């Protein structure tokens, strides 16, 4: 649900959003869409501050649900002890 189903449309980006800002929305939308289905969980200058506010909160929450409900880190260490 990460590699596909999301495409940055180069044609319909408004001029008043820089090409880098358009990759922070495609990443906040994907971070919430993936948090619901697969993870199985449910919950200008002020404009630039809104994107970053929606970034430094959603992503920081995605790791918490991915380290407490699934222990993503505890598998990396365990996948070195045995498989390596």
């Amino acid at each position: 649900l990460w590699h596909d189903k999301y495409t940055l449309r180069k044609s319909m980006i408004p001029s008043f959003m820089t090409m880098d800002q358009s990759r922070k929305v495609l990443l906040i939308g994907k971070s919430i869409n993936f948090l619901h289905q697969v993870c199985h969980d449910q919950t200008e200058n002020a404009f630039q501050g809104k994107i970053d506010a929606a970034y430094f909160e959603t992503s920081k929450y995605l790791l918490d649900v991915l380290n407490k409900k699934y222990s993503l880190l505890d598998h990396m260490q365990a996948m070195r002890r045995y498989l390596l």
Binding site: H36, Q37, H40, Q42
Partner: protein
Amino acid sequence: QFSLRVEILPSYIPVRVAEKILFVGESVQMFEKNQEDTFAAELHRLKQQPLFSLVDFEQVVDRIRSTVAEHLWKLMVEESDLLGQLKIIKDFYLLGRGELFQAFIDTAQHMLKTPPTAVTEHDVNVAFQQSAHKVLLDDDNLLPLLHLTIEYHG
């Protein structure tokens, strides 16, 4: 005793949740507080959604499912003691109390090597009853619940 339908079931609905529905209901019809109204608000809420989102349809079903299952386990073990009943099945079905059978075999032996007739069905229920008393097992409970059968004439 209800069933499920597949030839009429919707397309986008998976069979997994369909099975979940079939169990959460039959567990009520057979079974004849706050866990009743709150869910009604949840179901009504979905009726307001202008787009059917399966990813949410399950988060309300599974909670309802886990609540009745948690409520049913409370009765199937604590109130209606399953351990005692399983302890009965292991003893008699699976020959757990083998000491009862070596005496029953010792007595009800000649009356079974002959081919079976219409009378042998009662000729053993007594011998089995003579057995439980022969091993000083005195319990009017669970004693008449055990009835040996004779598959005769077919």
